[PDB]
Amino acid sequence: MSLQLVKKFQKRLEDIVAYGGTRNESSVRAAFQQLLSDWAEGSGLRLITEVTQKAVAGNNVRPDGTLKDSLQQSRGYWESKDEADTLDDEIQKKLAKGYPRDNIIFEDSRLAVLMQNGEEVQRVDMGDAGALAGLLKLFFEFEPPQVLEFRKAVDHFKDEMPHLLKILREAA
Amino acid sequence: SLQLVKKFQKRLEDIVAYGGTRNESSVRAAFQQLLSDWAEGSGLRLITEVTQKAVAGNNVRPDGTLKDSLQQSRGYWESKDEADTLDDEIQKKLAKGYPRDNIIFEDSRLAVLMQNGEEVQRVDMGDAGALAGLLKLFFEFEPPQVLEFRKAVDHFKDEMPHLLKILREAADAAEQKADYRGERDHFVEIAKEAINPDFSPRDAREMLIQHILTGDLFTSVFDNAQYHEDNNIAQQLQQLAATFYKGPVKRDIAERTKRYYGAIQAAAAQIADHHEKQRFLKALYENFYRAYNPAGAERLGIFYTPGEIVRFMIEATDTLLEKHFQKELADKGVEILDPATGTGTFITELIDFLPKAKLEQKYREELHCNELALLPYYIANLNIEATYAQKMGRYEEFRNIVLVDTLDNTGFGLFGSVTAENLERAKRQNARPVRVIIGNPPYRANQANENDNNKNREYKEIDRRIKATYVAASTAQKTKLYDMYSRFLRWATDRLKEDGIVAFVSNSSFIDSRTFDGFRKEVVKDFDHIYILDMKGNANTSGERRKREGGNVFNDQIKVGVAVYFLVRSDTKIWYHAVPDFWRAREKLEWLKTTKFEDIEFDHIRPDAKHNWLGQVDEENDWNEFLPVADKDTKQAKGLGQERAIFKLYSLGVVTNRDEWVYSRAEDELADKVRYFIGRYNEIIKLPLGDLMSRNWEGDIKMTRATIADAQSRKSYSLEKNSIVPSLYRPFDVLKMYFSKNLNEMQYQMPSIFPKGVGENVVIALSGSPAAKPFQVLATDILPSLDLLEKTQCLPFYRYTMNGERLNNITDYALKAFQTHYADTSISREDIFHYVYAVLHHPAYREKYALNLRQEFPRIPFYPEFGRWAAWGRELMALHIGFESVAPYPLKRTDEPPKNDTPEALALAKKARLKVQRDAAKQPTGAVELDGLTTLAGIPAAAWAYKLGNRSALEWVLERHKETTPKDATIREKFNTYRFADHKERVIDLLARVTTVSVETVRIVGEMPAETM
DNA sequence: CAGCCCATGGACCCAGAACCACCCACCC
DNA sequence: GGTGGGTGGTTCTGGGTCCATGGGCTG
DNA sequence: CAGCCCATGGACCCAGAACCACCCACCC
DNA sequence: GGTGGGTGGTTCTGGGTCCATGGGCTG
Ligand SMILES: C[S@@+](CC[C@H](N)C(=O)[O-])C[C@H]1O[C@@H](n2cnc3c(N)ncnc32)[C@H](O)[C@@H]1O
Ligand SMILES: [Ca+2]
Ligand SMILES: [Ca+2]
């Protein structure tokens, strides 16, 4: 993942605008769609594209792609724009319509913004492989606080098993 | 790949499982990735959601469009929801104008391809093998642009003669400028020491026309104008062209030549794959020479190797490299050299085989090649450089191509000094350690006719080494081992200094030829494993053999036999596999595509004592039974010890080298052709000595080696009137002939058989060795030609010594041996003669000892009766000795008037046809259509079985009475007078008389024993 | 005589909106 | 089975600025 | 040594022959 | 309206020669 996959995306973005003669989002999205999809396959998640979600307002909204788990539970989202728009301006309108913000990569072909827990965690340039590979690591690993607390309780056992084994040995 | 299809099948399952939605928008990503990843390997890219204006002005946006590197749509895709009837939804989209050229409509479970507005295939996406097949079709669809490109390449070939007229005129007008003449003269001198000792102005102007032609096409259809500015050779030749080709002169020839270049340029610009545009390179190569210098094309061997053969050898070389040397073609160290590049096919197909990670090093220092002609050099350098560019992505100059004579650059020197860089490349190549010498060497045994004055060049060193190795070990009278293919094989053996493989495609003569017996002894001593694959195809054959040989693996464009051979040097194991008989060219070429070297079941060949690899006599006969003649019995002086054969002297029929000038049906007509010949000859011997020696005369007469030598010695000729004699040219064809030593190239020992042409001798003429036609024997009382029967060898009954008498040629050794086996002193010489004749007509003898007869003089058995056989041979003899004095078999004559009463229909209706009327089962009906008016009928089926060669006796009297057009210009326009109308009545009688002869001999031969001794 | 007043007309471009194509939810 | 709505693309259409910079004054 | 004999296999091409396409004439 | 010539083009397909020229004699 990381370098290998991101560098293939950089070449694919170039092949799309070269063999297609279009820098339109609807055509250039395939590059980041396949980055997010192939990274997910390795992390036990899948990027399912165009999945309609409902907002608090009741407005149905369809992000470009959602990161679904094995139990059909959304864990992250993605929206691509073209290079011919202001990413920051499209961001307020998107979230105003009722877009999710728990874990969303808003991305134009040149800049990528990760918004986690409602705040912009990182803003990288897609030209820098290592930088993008860093942001995508945080996106694919962001976990809800439920699993964050379970993981912490597993660590508690690693220092509680000795104390527990004493009782069982005393009983044996 | 099936792996790609199998991943789609999994991706689809996960999308409906991890996502929970079967909506088309969500499930389409599985096929989008399949199409996109397949395309990334095929040089195309699936661009998604690209809008296309439909024919009805409306805009349609398919889910995906396959696009080429020139941003040109090559295919389309529209996914639907499984919750619909695909068939119904296809119609809706197609009615809104969705493209129907190459579209994959696809619901999640079923896929439909509509190529050319018609459903080519409908598959289920649960089957991986089926989807992979449907996808292959879609990804390999031939768009209209590539078909139009192919069509225009075919028009360019026929319009090449007219383009070369404009370019010739330009170069002719250039010799009016002193600057061009100066540069031209410097170039000729430079290339008289770099390319060929006899480089002439003609060769220089060909090179200039080639430069200007290639220049235009390389900038317009191949978009590599820089090639010339980076090519060392191109920069030495642009010096010559810069004198005249500039400004108005160039603008004028360009406006005229644009009418030929226009169509090809238009179509080629819409083609991205160089593997499609390399078909134009092949066409320029083969057609330029055919239109400009057909003669130089023969000496260079301008032909292209079909891709299937090239690919096969590259794969089979890798196989034997791993088997005997534990190396691969991609491994560093294996330096591959193509001694004759041509279009560069072998090197460009190696680039496509070698892995990308290793290609860089190989292209830079391990792939090498040589060329002699300029058009081939330029075409190869561009082909090689552009094939590398397509595979790698970057353009690098191939600095391993040399314009040098491979058979002269044996300085391992001024060879290759056209430019300074070319000389470096030549000296560097002659030091490189070459492991593999792959290639298709030029083949040319001899010039076709002496009048061509286009003999093969002499290569002192190679020729001297061939003489010491191949020729010295050959027990043949005629050596054809100075063929250009044999010269390129000697060079290869010597170039491989240590170990390696020489993989070549060449004439299959080496396998079986009386002349290549020395090669078949020397090759086993310099190579350890020899793997021959005979693809047959020899069309210089006739009869059932021609049908067996089949088509030529070179797209049926050459007539010689072809064999792909691999000679490895690590006893000698000779392996041989032959392609099946009665096959076609496409069948043979598809076999090379499908079969891999491992699958071929080669047969171990064990050379015999005469080094014959194929066609070995069965050593379980009593074949050591007498001998009709032996080279020693003929060369012996006296003594029965050295006289061990039935006959002493034997000769071959007179060969003239000018058959059309010395043979005619009428005595008076011959005399006129012969008078013209002697007439123009006597004017040739008056020319200046310079012109005499340089063979600079108008070639209206046929001057053979002998006549050329006498002319240069100023020896006059005259017409001896008593030299026009009767001669049996072909079976049953008694044409008149001028038997003079001055106008007949080789009379052999026929002066001693038929003294002065008119003598009294009866000869049993047989076939020679090796007979490619069935064994034939005919008795003649008139001088036979060398080609009455294949390589006719005449055995005479008498022998006329000089100032002497007819000494009986049947030896006394034979007389006694026959009067001893049969214990009958009555047996005479004029009885053994007839006995031998009947034995040589015995059907079981000709069948059992066939292989023996094909390779040796026919040894004769000692049949029990003698009397019965001698009688048969007497009856047989008389039938052929007096075939003009037999009883004409009654043949019904039917006559018909011309279609109309116009003078011109009568003309087109007294012209000969002489065709045997056959059936739908191709069996003689028993009727011959002599001309358009007369048709003979009533011929028995038996008469169609006396076959002298591949033709019946009757088919011989029809063939040799047809009005064929003379192949000599003068004879055709001044001495062609034969009209079947004049001889019609004669051929009618001859047919009936020969019908009797044939029907008699089928009976006489049929009453002979069913078994042979 | 160098500051100090007095004109006077300028070789585009980009946000609203319409509307369109396509597919998904939504009635029907 | 349309229908409206979500999303992205593709035409039209409408509608309008501060400020350079030569010349005449002018005390 | 030049002046006789003796071989020996040869880098295609092209005339019918369908068999179409188109369409005038000929029945139907 | 088919239907067979008339005319021209467009593919296959079948089927096959005399004679160069080195080497070995030879006297
Ligand atoms: C059959 S073509 C090469 C074929 C090549 N395999 C191809 O696929 O195009 C024979 C070529 O050998 C070349 N050649 C190179 N060196 C030669 C030489 N010394 N003598 C004769 N031809 C030579 C000729 O110019 C001619 O183009
Ligand atoms: Ca988007
Ligand atoms: Ca679709």
Side-chain angles (χ1 to χ4, degrees), chain B residues 54-79:
Chain B
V55 89
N58 76 97
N59 286 292
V60 281
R61 202 177 349 124
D63 286 348
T65 297
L66 196 64
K67 283 263 208 193
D68 223 345
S69 77
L70 304 170
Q71 311 171 5
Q72 280 183 149
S73 295
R74 261 260 219 139
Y76 304 94
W77 156 64
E78 175 61 45
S79 199

mmCIF file of all heavy atoms in Angstrom, chain B residues 54-79:
data_model
loop_
_atom_site.group_PDB
_atom_site.id
_atom_site.type_symbol
_atom_site.label_atom_id
_atom_site.label_comp_id
_atom_site.label_asym_id
_atom_site.label_seq_id
_atom_site.Cartn_x
_atom_site.Cartn_y
_atom_site.Cartn_z
ATOM 1 N N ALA B 54 -24.573 11.921 -30.452
ATOM 2 C CA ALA B 54 -25.163 10.860 -31.304
ATOM 3 C C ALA B 54 -25.526 11.430 -32.680
ATOM 4 O O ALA B 54 -25.518 12.668 -32.835
ATOM 5 C CB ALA B 54 -26.363 10.256 -30.621
ATOM 6 N N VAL B 55 -25.883 10.563 -33.632
ATOM 7 C CA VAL B 55 -26.173 11.021 -35.026
ATOM 8 C C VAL B 55 -27.408 11.936 -35.056
ATOM 9 O O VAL B 55 -27.533 12.716 -36.020
ATOM 10 C CB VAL B 55 -26.289 9.824 -35.994
ATOM 11 C CG1 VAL B 55 -27.703 9.270 -36.093
ATOM 12 C CG2 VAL B 55 -25.727 10.140 -37.372
ATOM 13 N N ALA B 56 -28.268 11.878 -34.032
ATOM 14 C CA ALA B 56 -29.512 12.684 -34.029
ATOM 15 C C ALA B 56 -29.301 14.000 -33.271
ATOM 16 O O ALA B 56 -30.298 14.542 -32.755
ATOM 17 C CB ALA B 56 -30.645 11.878 -33.443
ATOM 18 N N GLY B 57 -28.060 14.498 -33.218
ATOM 19 C CA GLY B 57 -27.774 15.789 -32.559
ATOM 20 C C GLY B 57 -27.822 15.683 -31.044
ATOM 21 O O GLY B 57 -27.236 16.559 -30.378
ATOM 22 N N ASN B 58 -28.482 14.645 -30.517
ATOM 23 C CA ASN B 58 -28.597 14.454 -29.051
ATOM 24 C C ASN B 58 -27.232 14.029 -28.514
ATOM 25 O O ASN B 58 -26.424 13.537 -29.299
ATOM 26 C CB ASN B 58 -29.732 13.494 -28.694
ATOM 27 C CG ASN B 58 -29.402 12.039 -28.938
ATOM 28 O OD1 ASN B 58 -29.005 11.330 -28.018
ATOM 29 N ND2 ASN B 58 -29.585 11.580 -30.164
ATOM 30 N N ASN B 59 -26.984 14.242 -27.222
ATOM 31 C CA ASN B 59 -25.718 13.784 -26.605
ATOM 32 C C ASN B 59 -26.013 12.513 -25.812
ATOM 33 O O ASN B 59 -27.036 12.485 -25.123
ATOM 34 C CB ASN B 59 -25.124 14.861 -25.702
ATOM 35 C CG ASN B 59 -24.513 16.009 -26.473
ATOM 36 O OD1 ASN B 59 -23.493 15.843 -27.137
ATOM 37 N ND2 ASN B 59 -25.124 17.178 -26.385
ATOM 38 N N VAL B 60 -25.200 11.474 -25.984
ATOM 39 C CA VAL B 60 -25.362 10.232 -25.180
ATOM 40 C C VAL B 60 -24.081 10.068 -24.367
ATOM 41 O O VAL B 60 -23.012 10.345 -24.912
ATOM 42 C CB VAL B 60 -25.652 9.005 -26.063
ATOM 43 C CG1 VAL B 60 -27.103 8.967 -26.508
ATOM 44 C CG2 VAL B 60 -24.725 8.891 -27.260
ATOM 45 N N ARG B 61 -24.183 9.639 -23.109
ATOM 46 C CA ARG B 61 -22.982 9.431 -22.259
ATOM 47 C C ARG B 61 -22.899 7.966 -21.829
ATOM 48 O O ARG B 61 -23.495 7.620 -20.797
ATOM 49 C CB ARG B 61 -23.052 10.354 -21.042
ATOM 50 C CG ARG B 61 -21.712 10.634 -20.383
ATOM 51 C CD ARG B 61 -21.892 11.604 -19.235
ATOM 52 N NE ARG B 61 -23.217 12.207 -19.227
ATOM 53 C CZ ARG B 61 -24.058 12.162 -18.200
ATOM 54 N NH1 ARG B 61 -23.718 11.530 -17.091
ATOM 55 N NH2 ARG B 61 -25.240 12.743 -18.289
ATOM 56 N N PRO B 62 -22.215 7.038 -22.559
ATOM 57 C CA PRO B 62 -22.088 5.666 -22.079
ATOM 58 C C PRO B 62 -21.342 5.594 -20.744
ATOM 59 O O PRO B 62 -20.583 6.488 -20.456
ATOM 60 C CB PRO B 62 -21.306 4.937 -23.173
ATOM 61 C CG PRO B 62 -21.597 5.728 -24.409
ATOM 62 C CD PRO B 62 -21.573 7.148 -23.899
ATOM 63 N N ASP B 63 -21.553 4.521 -19.981
ATOM 64 C CA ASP B 63 -20.917 4.375 -18.646
ATOM 65 C C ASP B 63 -19.403 4.408 -18.810
ATOM 66 O O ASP B 63 -18.735 4.924 -17.916
ATOM 67 C CB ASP B 63 -21.424 3.131 -17.920
ATOM 68 C CG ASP B 63 -22.837 3.291 -17.395
ATOM 69 O OD1 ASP B 63 -23.328 4.430 -17.389
ATOM 70 O OD2 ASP B 63 -23.435 2.274 -17.008
ATOM 71 N N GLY B 64 -18.885 3.914 -19.931
ATOM 72 C CA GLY B 64 -17.432 3.959 -20.169
ATOM 73 C C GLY B 64 -17.072 3.903 -21.635
ATOM 74 O O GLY B 64 -17.823 3.292 -22.391
ATOM 75 N N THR B 65 -15.953 4.508 -22.017
ATOM 76 C CA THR B 65 -15.502 4.507 -23.428
ATOM 77 C C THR B 65 -14.045 4.068 -23.469
ATOM 78 O O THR B 65 -13.220 4.747 -22.857
ATOM 79 C CB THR B 65 -15.618 5.910 -24.025
ATOM 80 O OG1 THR B 65 -16.996 6.279 -24.012
ATOM 81 C CG2 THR B 65 -15.078 6.006 -25.433
ATOM 82 N N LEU B 66 -13.720 2.998 -24.190
ATOM 83 C CA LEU B 66 -12.303 2.586 -24.353
ATOM 84 C C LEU B 66 -11.643 3.590 -25.289
ATOM 85 O O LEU B 66 -12.181 3.792 -26.375
ATOM 86 C CB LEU B 66 -12.283 1.188 -24.970
ATOM 87 C CG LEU B 66 -10.967 0.433 -24.866
ATOM 88 C CD1 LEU B 66 -10.646 0.158 -23.410
ATOM 89 C CD2 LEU B 66 -11.047 -0.864 -25.651
ATOM 90 N N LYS B 67 -10.534 4.201 -24.878
ATOM 91 C CA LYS B 67 -9.902 5.261 -25.702
ATOM 92 C C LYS B 67 -8.444 4.913 -25.983
ATOM 93 O O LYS B 67 -7.796 4.346 -25.100
ATOM 94 C CB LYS B 67 -9.994 6.608 -24.990
ATOM 95 C CG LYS B 67 -11.355 7.280 -25.035
ATOM 96 C CD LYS B 67 -11.457 8.308 -26.126
ATOM 97 C CE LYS B 67 -12.434 9.415 -25.804
ATOM 98 N NZ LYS B 67 -12.735 10.230 -27.002
ATOM 99 N N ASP B 68 -7.944 5.281 -27.159
ATOM 100 C CA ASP B 68 -6.540 4.990 -27.544
ATOM 101 C C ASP B 68 -5.647 6.141 -27.102
ATOM 102 O O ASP B 68 -6.141 7.049 -26.433
ATOM 103 C CB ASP B 68 -6.408 4.865 -29.058
ATOM 104 C CG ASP B 68 -5.530 3.708 -29.494
ATOM 105 O OD1 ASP B 68 -4.793 3.182 -28.637
ATOM 106 O OD2 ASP B 68 -5.587 3.348 -30.684
ATOM 107 N N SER B 69 -4.378 6.128 -27.505
ATOM 108 C CA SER B 69 -3.417 7.168 -27.065
ATOM 109 C C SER B 69 -3.639 8.446 -27.864
ATOM 110 O O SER B 69 -3.118 9.495 -27.458
ATOM 111 C CB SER B 69 -2.027 6.671 -27.238
ATOM 112 O OG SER B 69 -1.648 6.725 -28.602
ATOM 113 N N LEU B 70 -4.353 8.346 -28.985
ATOM 114 C CA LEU B 70 -4.658 9.533 -29.821
ATOM 115 C C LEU B 70 -6.048 10.016 -29.421
ATOM 116 O O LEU B 70 -6.685 10.689 -30.241
ATOM 117 C CB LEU B 70 -4.625 9.117 -31.292
ATOM 118 C CG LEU B 70 -3.331 8.471 -31.770
ATOM 119 C CD1 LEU B 70 -3.511 7.898 -33.164
ATOM 120 C CD2 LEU B 70 -2.191 9.475 -31.755
ATOM 121 N N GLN B 71 -6.488 9.655 -28.214
ATOM 122 C CA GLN B 71 -7.821 10.061 -27.705
ATOM 123 C C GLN B 71 -8.888 9.683 -28.726
ATOM 124 O O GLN B 71 -9.739 10.531 -29.021
ATOM 125 C CB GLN B 71 -7.833 11.548 -27.365
ATOM 126 C CG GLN B 71 -6.650 11.982 -26.516
ATOM 127 C CD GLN B 71 -6.569 13.481 -26.385
ATOM 128 O OE1 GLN B 71 -7.445 14.209 -26.844
ATOM 129 N NE2 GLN B 71 -5.510 13.954 -25.751
ATOM 130 N N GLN B 72 -8.839 8.452 -29.236
ATOM 131 C CA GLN B 72 -9.815 7.987 -30.251
ATOM 132 C C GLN B 72 -10.600 6.814 -29.673
ATOM 133 O O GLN B 72 -9.960 5.862 -29.231
ATOM 134 C CB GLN B 72 -9.077 7.560 -31.514
ATOM 135 C CG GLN B 72 -8.678 8.725 -32.401
ATOM 136 C CD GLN B 72 -8.009 8.246 -33.662
ATOM 137 O OE1 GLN B 72 -8.112 8.870 -34.714
ATOM 138 N NE2 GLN B 72 -7.320 7.122 -33.563
ATOM 139 N N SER B 73 -11.931 6.885 -29.688
ATOM 140 C CA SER B 73 -12.781 5.825 -29.081
ATOM 141 C C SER B 73 -12.668 4.506 -29.842
ATOM 142 O O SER B 73 -12.957 4.498 -31.043
ATOM 143 C CB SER B 73 -14.193 6.277 -29.037
ATOM 144 O OG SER B 73 -14.331 7.389 -28.170
ATOM 145 N N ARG B 74 -12.301 3.428 -29.143
ATOM 146 C CA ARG B 74 -12.102 2.102 -29.789
ATOM 147 C C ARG B 74 -13.187 1.128 -29.317
ATOM 148 O O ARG B 74 -13.276 0.028 -29.900
ATOM 149 C CB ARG B 74 -10.730 1.567 -29.374
ATOM 150 C CG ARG B 74 -9.629 1.780 -30.401
ATOM 151 C CD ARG B 74 -9.444 0.484 -31.166
ATOM 152 N NE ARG B 74 -8.024 0.274 -31.398
ATOM 153 C CZ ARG B 74 -7.400 -0.891 -31.287
ATOM 154 N NH1 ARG B 74 -8.072 -1.974 -30.941
ATOM 155 N NH2 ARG B 74 -6.104 -0.961 -31.520
ATOM 156 N N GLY B 75 -13.969 1.511 -28.304
ATOM 157 C CA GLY B 75 -15.008 0.628 -27.742
ATOM 158 C C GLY B 75 -15.865 1.352 -26.727
ATOM 159 O O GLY B 75 -15.480 2.455 -26.343
ATOM 160 N N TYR B 76 -16.979 0.753 -26.299
ATOM 161 C CA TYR B 76 -17.917 1.416 -25.356
ATOM 162 C C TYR B 76 -18.483 0.391 -24.373
ATOM 163 O O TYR B 76 -18.372 -0.801 -24.653
ATOM 164 C CB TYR B 76 -19.059 2.068 -26.134
ATOM 165 C CG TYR B 76 -18.632 3.046 -27.196
ATOM 166 C CD1 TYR B 76 -18.463 2.646 -28.510
ATOM 167 C CD2 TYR B 76 -18.384 4.370 -26.883
ATOM 168 C CE1 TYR B 76 -18.052 3.534 -29.487
ATOM 169 C CE2 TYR B 76 -17.984 5.274 -27.849
ATOM 170 C CZ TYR B 76 -17.819 4.855 -29.156
ATOM 171 O OH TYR B 76 -17.428 5.740 -30.116
ATOM 172 N N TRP B 77 -19.087 0.844 -23.272
ATOM 173 C CA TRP B 77 -19.693 -0.069 -22.265
ATOM 174 C C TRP B 77 -20.875 0.613 -21.581
ATOM 175 O O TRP B 77 -20.737 1.786 -21.225
ATOM 176 C CB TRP B 77 -18.645 -0.503 -21.238
ATOM 177 C CG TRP B 77 -19.183 -0.942 -19.911
ATOM 178 C CD1 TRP B 77 -19.989 -2.013 -19.661
ATOM 179 C CD2 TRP B 77 -18.922 -0.331 -18.637
ATOM 180 N NE1 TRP B 77 -20.266 -2.094 -18.324
ATOM 181 C CE2 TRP B 77 -19.618 -1.082 -17.669
ATOM 182 C CE3 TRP B 77 -18.172 0.772 -18.220
ATOM 183 C CZ2 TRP B 77 -19.588 -0.760 -16.315
ATOM 184 C CZ3 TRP B 77 -18.144 1.090 -16.882
ATOM 185 C CH2 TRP B 77 -18.845 0.335 -15.946
ATOM 186 N N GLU B 78 -21.993 -0.091 -21.418
ATOM 187 C CA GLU B 78 -23.140 0.471 -20.670
ATOM 188 C C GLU B 78 -23.662 -0.610 -19.729
ATOM 189 O O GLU B 78 -24.161 -1.626 -20.223
ATOM 190 C CB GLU B 78 -24.217 0.977 -21.623
ATOM 191 C CG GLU B 78 -25.475 1.467 -20.932
ATOM 192 C CD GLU B 78 -25.303 2.643 -19.985
ATOM 193 O OE1 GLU B 78 -24.604 3.601 -20.353
ATOM 194 O OE2 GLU B 78 -25.879 2.597 -18.885
ATOM 195 N N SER B 79 -23.517 -0.402 -18.423
ATOM 196 C CA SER B 79 -24.032 -1.370 -17.427
ATOM 197 C C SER B 79 -25.497 -1.065 -17.146
ATOM 198 O O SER B 79 -25.875 0.109 -17.231
ATOM 199 C CB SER B 79 -23.242 -1.305 -16.164
ATOM 200 O OG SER B 79 -23.429 -2.482 -15.394
#
